[PDB]
Structures are given as structure tokens and as C-alpha cells.
């Protein structure tokens, strides 16, 4: 029953974005079957089916626009017809919750530990900045959680709609730029240690972090500007989302650039970096910090991959296609999986610490060692 109801709405969207009568008719045929497949409830479905036949008659005559109008009136009838969340949305909620609790407490503890050594050790500066980016990202989670609980209703305003869903993308660019800087530092410690003795100081590390943060912000603005709220009417609510309407080329362009700058180019460059570093290390007779950073780097690509795959696929698909509709329903889940980046670092630090007393003292040993 609940599955047939989604069949109706899915084909309803198909009609809304239909190019000809053939697609309208095909969609309407599937709606009829789904409606009949699904005494007071019988009447409602009966009114629905008749309206489908009305629209179906118009589409059979070849009148596409008139048939689509009759299909829009079908939505008015739907309101007269068990508001449970989709499976992917529910999993997103579970993940969101865990990431929030672990990420807020975990990264707050990291910031605490590394703040003290931040002017004494370069590594503390690196790990501090990664934690701050992860903590800040987690702050959006309660509001994202709430909106999904309220079936995507967004009562927080336009400003929050632009900012809060953007913090995960900010986290993407900030994390990977910081990791790029950390990786450059690791590379130089191993292959150009004379550079490190002449240059490497807390001052340069803080400047590199400033630039990394700044660049991340600039990379986030374009998508930030394309977020809008949208008011719905059946059932009435307010949605928060992205708007590349009448600009399918830009949607595709954004998706591709995000794939390259946010995933592919870092994957290439950091894998080269650590191939150099690991083969050097393994051919000779500091691994603690190195092992931690590799883990954090690895976890970045593991948890962003589904986001990136679904993102690219949707951009190359028509919005009326079954595969697009399926991927759309998975969007929140994919972002929730990406959000695991914002709680995974403290988990990594504690596990790496286990292989070495209290929790803050354990983080100190792992995160504030000097080279």
C-alpha cells in the first residue's frame, strides 16, 4: 500500500516533466494500475482512478498540456486520501544521530587537547584545525535531523537554509585542503628535512591553515548562493533545497567540478604523496602520527564516494527518469554517510592510541608528538 502510494507520486512527477503524450499516457497507465492495486478508502481511490481516466482520455487524444492539467488536479484529491518516512531517510536519521553525539564530544575533546600544545607543536595545529572543521559541521545536524523528521519541512528560514546544509560542503573543502597541507608537511619531513629545519614553524602552519579555510569558504559560496526555500501546497509545507531550474548545464557543471576538486584531484595527488612516503618508510629501518593521518585521509574518500557517485549520476540523468527518482530518495542517506567524516577522526585517534591512561591523555600522546 505504501509502495503503491510512492508509485502514484513518482509517475505524477513524470507527468509534470513530460515531453509528449506518450510519456503522459504511460505514466498514467502505471498510476491506474497502482491505484486499483491499492469503503471510505475505496471511494477516495475511486475518485482518483476516474481522474486518471479523465487525464488518460486527454492524453489518448494527444492533448499533452490538458492531460497534465488534469493530472495536477489529481494532487488535490490526494489530500483527501500512515505518514511514515522512507527507509533511506530513516537510516540517514540514525547515522546523523550517532555522528552528532560522537562528533561533538569527540572533536570538542580534540580541540581541547590540541589547543594547549598548539603553540608548542605543529601537529597540534593540524589536528586542532581538522577538529574545528568537523565540530562546526556537526552543529548543523540537529536542524537537518529535525527537518527530515518533519518530512523535509523547513521552518528555519531562508538564511538557515542557505548556511546549515552548506556546512557539510565547507567541511569537504576545508578538510581536504587541511589534509593537503598536512600531507605536504609529512612529505617534507621525510624528503626535504633541511627545508623543515629552516622553514617549518608555528607561524607558517597557521598561515597555511588560514589560506586553507579561506579557499574552502570561496569554494563553498557558489553552491551556497543556489540554495533556496520553496513553498509547497499539497500537503502544504516549506522545502529547503537547491535550484538549478532552467539551467541543467550548470547543475552538470557544478557536479563535475565538485567531483574533480572535491574527490578526484585530491585522490590522485594524496595517493602519489603517500606512495612516495610509504615506500620510503618501508624500505628503511615516526609511523604513529603518519599512520593516523593516512587513516584520516583514507576515511575521507571512503565516506564521500557514495555522495560523489550519486551526484554525478543524477546530473547526467533526466529528472523524469526512474533512476533519477531513485537516486533523489537516497540523497539524505548519501550525505549522512559523508557526515561520518565529522566524527571518524576521534575514533581513529582512540584506536591508534590503544596501540600505544585517560582519554585526554591518550589523545595528547597521539596528536601532539614532535618530529
Amino acid at each position: 500500500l505504501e509502495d503503491n502510494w510512492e508509485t502514484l507520486n513518482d509517475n505524477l512527477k513524470v507527468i509534470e516533466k513530460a515531453d509528449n503524450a506518450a510519456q503522459v499516457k504511460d505514466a498514467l497507465t502505471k498510476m491506474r494500475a497502482a491505484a486499483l492495486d491499492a469503503k471510505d478508502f475505496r471511494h477516495g481511490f475511486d475518485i482518483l482512478v476516474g481522474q486518471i481516466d479523465d487525464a488518460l482520455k486527454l492524453a489518448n487524444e494527444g492533448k499533452v498540456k490538458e492531460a497534465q492539467a488534469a493530472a495536477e488536479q489529481l494532487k488535490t484529491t490526494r489530500n483527501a486520501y500512515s505518514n511514515t518516512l522512507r527507509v533511506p531517510d530513516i537510516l540517514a536519521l540514525v547515522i546523523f544521530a550517532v555522528v552528532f553525539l560522537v562528533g561533538v564530544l569527540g572533536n570538542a575533546l580534540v580541540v581541547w587537547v590540541t589547543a594547549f600544545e598548539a603553540k608548542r607543536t605543529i601537529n597540534a595545529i593540524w589536528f586542532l584545525n581538522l577538529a574545528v572543521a568537523d565540530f562546526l559541521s556537526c552543529l548543523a545536524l540537529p536542524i537537518l535531523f529535525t527537518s527530515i523528521v518533519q518530512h523535509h519541512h523547513w521552518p528555519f528560514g531562508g538564511a538557515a537554509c542557505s548556511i546549515l546544509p552548506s556546512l557539510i560542503l565547507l567541511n569537504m573543502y576545508a578538510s581536504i585542503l587541511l589534509l593537503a597541507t598536512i600531507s605536504a608537511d609529512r612529505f617534507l619531513l621525510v624528503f626535504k628535512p633541511i627545508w623543515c629545519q629552516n622553514f617549518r614553524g608555528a607561524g607558517l602552519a597557521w598561515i597555511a591553515c588560514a589560506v586553507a579555510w579561506g579557499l574552502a569558504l570561496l569554494l563553498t559560496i557558489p553552491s551556497f548562493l543556489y540554495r533556496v526555500v520553496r513553498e509547497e501546497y499539497f500537503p502544504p509545507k516549506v522545502l529547503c533545497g537547491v535550484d538549478y531550474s532552467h539551467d541543467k548545464r550548470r547543475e552538470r557543471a557544478v557536479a563535475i567540478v565538485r567531483l574533480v576538486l572535491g574527490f578526484l584531484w585530491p585522490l590522485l595527488t594524496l595517493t602519489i604523496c603517500y606512495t612516495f612516503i610509504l615506500l620510503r618508510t618501508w624500505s628503511r629501518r615516526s609511523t604513529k602520527t603518519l599512520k593516523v593521518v593516512v587513516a584520516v585521509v583514507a576515511s575521507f574518500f571512503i565516506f564521500w564516494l557514495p555522495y560523489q557517485v550519486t551526484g554525478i549520476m543524477m546530473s547526467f540523468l533526466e529528472p523524469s527518469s526512474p533512476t533519477f527518482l531513485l537516486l533523489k530518495k537516497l540523497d539524505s542517506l548519501c550525505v549522512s554517510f559523508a557526515y561520518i567524516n565529522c566524527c571518524i577522526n576521534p575514533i581513529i585517534y582512540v584506536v591508534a592510541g590503544q596501540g600505544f591512561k585517560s582519554l585526554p591523555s591518550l589523545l595528547r600522546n597521539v596528536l601532539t608528538e614532535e618530529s
Binding site: 523535509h152 546544509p165 557539510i168 533556496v228 520553496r230 522545502l239 529547503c240 533545497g241 537547491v242 535550484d243 538549478y244 531550474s245 557536479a255 550519486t310 551526484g311 543524477m314 537516486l327 533523489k328 540523497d331 539524505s332 550525505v335
Partner: peptide, 6 residues
């Protein structure tokens, strides 16, 4: 238009 992220 598309709610959420994509």
C-alpha cells in the same frame, strides 16, 4: 528545484 542537497 530539488530539496536537500541534490
Amino acid at each position: 528545484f530539488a530539496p536537500x542537497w541534490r
